[PDB]
């Protein structure tokens, strides 16, 4: 991804977008009770914690493109993964607006808390001013869509979230694109059935884990990945995606039976128009994290990518014995013979991708079930039911997250959520967690699940329904 053109908003007649200047994260009542090193990301330019230039850092992820056509490796990659998705019987038919906007099995209702984007955001108009979760009204939306169209600029927001000292210091805050409500809805219409199928079929056929529930899904993973594990990091995945990969994506959507017209939306993602604060810029390549389907699409591409590096480096490779699961840039994979991930990483670099050893590793080491992570979680078989596998989020991370809040009114929900995570570290660990929570008076006011109830409900969860 490369920033092609940049100018002042006033010159094209765009109003300044008034994004928030201060963080919503403050120290929680638990901030002194636990250790942690992370702090809210830098959102403004004058932040005294900065040890680099902010405007420069946030955009620097835009490292460049490699100009090329789809090669022989890409094609055969596309076909293999095409071969897989066909099994699923994805409907290329649009989805009925009601479903696309207000929910259905496999596609959550369009979130009414996020930005509506341009131009509504400029006009003080909020999502809730347009949609209602009570009347399922589409009369207003239809007016706005007809009024303002598709293909609108995107609004760029600095992601307000906890980060390490290194990234606060370097100003490497992450950017999120708010798509215009219309484009959101349109895309949901066009791809809703794809999304529905992806969320209902996490695993090695979709090669996706987007929408999954670790609690249930972890147990499936080792079953699906028989082989020697392959795992690894990207750096700036979304924004390094060159246009070539989008060509491949639309190439794959075409085999699923999407028309050229219907794939024009991939271009909307690839060559993008952004309204940042008082600037207005055009970007060629780069997945614009935050528009509709960016996770699914990031995964699908990744599915293409890895199969392409396998093919180019290991002539002889049989892909039908390959298995992968992506969540956007996060990949876990297996082959029956060892694979040198470093080879792949160097190969990938010729395509403008920065691959790295898994979990900020020193070298592309042996990947076991002991050290493998996915969505920041480890795997540990339950001591008692060995076919059951715990998703184990590290305590360090739970400790980090507990020390801040964006809204103390939700403490109960927040601490329960963290509870749902921590207990996989084991009873000793869980009881220390609970004691320290409880060493503050607010901690004593919270309804907190007992370990033994967490264990029971989990064991009980793999008793009903599918997967
Ligand atoms: N469309 C849409 C859409 C709407 C919102 N929103 O705020 O209402 C947010 C993300 C949206 O994109 C997706 C819509 C449906 C999907 F099945 C998947 C979408 O993309 C994601 C799916 C999953 C995740 N995730 O959980 O990380 C992030 C994204 C993103 N961006």
Author numbering: 1 to 467
Which sentences did the original study use to describe this structure?
The genome is replicated via a negative-sense RNA intermediate by 3Dpol, the viral RNA-dependent RNA polymerase (RdRP). For this, 3Dpol uses the viral protein 3B, in this context usually termed VPg (viral protein genome-linked), as a primer. Crystal structures have been reported of 3Dpol of the enteroviruses CVB3, PV, EV71, HRV1B, HRV14, and HRV16, and of the aphthovirus FMDV. These enzymes adopt a classical right hand architecture, with fingers, palm and thumb subdomains providing the correct geometrical arrangement of substrate molecules and metal ions at the polymerase active site for catalysis. Given its critical role in genome replication, 3Dpol is regarded as an attractive target for antiviral drugs.
We also solved the X-ray structure of the complex of CVB3 3Dpol with a second inhibitor of the GPC series, GPC-N143, at 2.7 Å resolution. This compound contains a central fluorophenyl ring instead of a chlorophenyl ring and displays similar antiviral activity as GPC-N114. As expected, the GPC-N143 binding site is identical to that of GPC-N114, establishing almost equivalent interactions. Thus, the crystallographic data demonstrate that GPC-N114 and GPC-N143 specifically interact with CVB3 3Dpol at the template channel without having major effects on the structure of the enzyme.
